[PDB]
Design a protein around this ligand. Sequence first.
Ligand SMILES: CC1(C)OC(=O)c2ccc(Nc3ncc(-c4nnco4)c(N[C@H](CO)c4ccccc4)n3)cc21
Ligand SMILES: CC1(C)OC(=O)c2ccc(Nc3ncc(-c4nnco4)c(N[C@H](CO)c4ccccc4)n3)cc21
Lengths: 288, 283
Amino acid sequence: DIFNRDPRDHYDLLQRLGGGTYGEVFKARDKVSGDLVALKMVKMEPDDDVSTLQKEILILKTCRHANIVAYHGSYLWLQKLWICMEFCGAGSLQDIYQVTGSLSELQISYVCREVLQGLAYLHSQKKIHRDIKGANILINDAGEVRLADFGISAQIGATLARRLSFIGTPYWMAPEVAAVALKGGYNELCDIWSLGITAIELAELQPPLFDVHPDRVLELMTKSGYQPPRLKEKGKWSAAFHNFIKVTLTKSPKKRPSATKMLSHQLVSQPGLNRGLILDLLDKLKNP
Amino acid sequence: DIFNRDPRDHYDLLQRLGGGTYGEVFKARDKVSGDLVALKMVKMEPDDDVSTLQKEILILKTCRHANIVAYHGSYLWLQKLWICMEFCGAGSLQDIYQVTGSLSELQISYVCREVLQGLAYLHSQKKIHRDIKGANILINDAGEVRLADFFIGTPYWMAPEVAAVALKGGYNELCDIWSLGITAIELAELQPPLFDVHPDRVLELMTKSGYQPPRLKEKGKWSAAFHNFIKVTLTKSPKKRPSATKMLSHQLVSQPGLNRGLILDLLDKLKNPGKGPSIGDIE
Ligand SMILES: CC1(C)OC(=O)c2ccc(Nc3ncc(-c4nnco4)c(N[C@H](CO)c4ccccc4)n3)cc21
Ligand SMILES: CC1(C)OC(=O)c2ccc(Nc3ncc(-c4nnco4)c(N[C@H](CO)c4ccccc4)n3)cc21
C-alpha cells in the first residue's frame, strides 16, 4: 500500500508544526486539490522492531469515522517514513485552553459527545485508544473534533502480539495471567475513565493530581481506598456535568458504562451541541 | 559464561534427552567424578552478552534450595551456551504419570508440600516461576522433588486498573499458587482442566466475567482436605489467594505420614510394569 515515492511530488511543505524523539510534523498543501494535510516524518532506517510504526499505520488505514483523524497515505523516500494525515488547523484542545483558558460546560459537552462517538466506533472495531487526553483531541478550522495519536495503542498492540505473546499452553495460567496475555489486564472501558479525566482537564486546565509527582500518583491510584476525583468548584457546573464525571470515573471497570451507553447521558444528549460552540472558542484564540 | 572452554573437556556426552525451541538437552557423565549431569545446549544468537550472559547466570547460581534443581556451571564454546544442571533420573512428573497413571492423594500431597517449599524460597528472593506444571517438576533417583525450567505513558489520565498493571505488572507471585492447584488436578486426572478445549478458546473462557475456578471431577475418590486445597489454591481473586508460606500450614500438606517414601514407591511402579521371562530358555 505504501508509496515508495518522494512526498514533495504530491505535496508542498509550508511550515514545521512540531517534533521530538519520534519525528517532525509539517503543515503541507496538496498540489492537485489544494487541500491541507499534516505530514509526520519519522526517521525509519536503522531502527529495530518497526512493528510500532506498522501497527499505527494499520490502525489509521482501517479507521474510517468522522471523529477519528483521517489517514491519506504513507511515503518511504530517503530512509524517512512520511505519514500523511488530516490537517487540524486549531491544533489540540490543550494548545487552545493554554491560551483561551477554561472551556464552558456546553463546549465540554460537545467535545465529550464527539470523543464518545469516536470511542464507540474504535471499540466496535475491537480497538482501544489508551491515551485519551486534551493533547490527543484535535480541532480543525470548522470546529470539528478528531481523536488522534494511536502511538500508545500501537506500542501496546505490538508488544501484546509478538514481543510478549509467544507463549504456549494457557491450561495452567491463573485468570489474571490469562488477562495480561490476551488483553494486557484491562479493557476498552479504560478510555471512558480517561474521557472523564479529560472533561475535568477542560474545566480546570489540569487533570486531577497534576501537581503530585507521577510515581506518587501511580501509588495513590493503586492504594485500596482510592476515591475517584471530582470537579473542584461545585456551583460552577450543573448536576448533569457532576453526574457525567461521577459515572465516567466509576472505580470498578465491571460497573463503568460503555461508550454507546454514555451517549444516552443528559450532558451529551442535550440539544444545542454543535461545532459553533468550538468556533466561539477559536474566536477567543484569534482575538486578544 | 563462567567457563570459556569446550564442555567435552570435562564431560562425556551419552545421549540426547530432548529438545525444542529451548535448545538441546543431553545426558552426560563427569570425567573426574563419574557423576551424571544434564547439559542444556542453547544456540547463542548474536544480540547481547553484558546482562544476558553474566547477570542471568549469576541469578541461576544464587538459587540455592533443596526443592530447586541444582546448577553446576556454564560453558561458551563455538557460539553455544551449555548449562550444566542436576541429572534428575526419573524425569518430570509428566514422564512418570504417563507410565504409572494417576498419583495417589498422599503422593500428590507430598509433591505439593515440596513445590510449596520451593515456591516460598523463590518468592522470598523476589522471583516468580511462572510455569508450574507436571513437566517442570523433576524427580531425581533419590525421590527428591525439584522445580525446574526458569512505563508506557503519563499516569494522570490512566484508569485505576491501567495504573495497577503499569506499577505492579498485571500479576504477582500468587500466579504460581494457582498453577500448583492446576498441577495437583493434573497429577490426579492425568490432564489439567479444559485440556480438550482449543488453547485460544481457553484464554477467552478464563478472561470471561463469569469464569468459575475448576474442581476435581470425582468427588468421593478424594478427601475433604484435598478438595479444600484445590478450592483455596484456585481462588479467582489474586488479592484473596493465599501465599506459599500460608499454604504450608494447610491440612493437606501439614498432615503426618508425608515423606520421600511415597515418591520412592512411585519410582518402583515405573521400574517394574514390564513382564518377566517365560520363553527365554538359555541355561
Ligand atoms: C502527530 C499527531 C498528533 O498524531 C496523529 O495521529 C495526527 C493526525 C493529524 C495531525 N494533524 C495536525 N494538524 C494540524 C496541527 C496544527 N495546526 N496548528 C497547530 O497544530 C496539529 N497539531 C498537533 C497538536 O499540536 C501536533 C502534534 C505534534 C506535533 C505537531 C503538531 N496536528 C496530527 C497528528
Ligand atoms: C531442561 C530442564 C527441564 O530445564 C532445567 O532447568 C533443567 C534442570 C535439570 C534437568 N535435568 C534432567 N535430568 C534428567 C532427565 C531425564 N532423565 N531421564 C529422562 O529425563 C531430565 N528430563 C527432563 C524432563 O523430561 C528433560 C526436559 C527436556 C528435555 C530433556 C529432558 N532432566 C533438566 C532441566
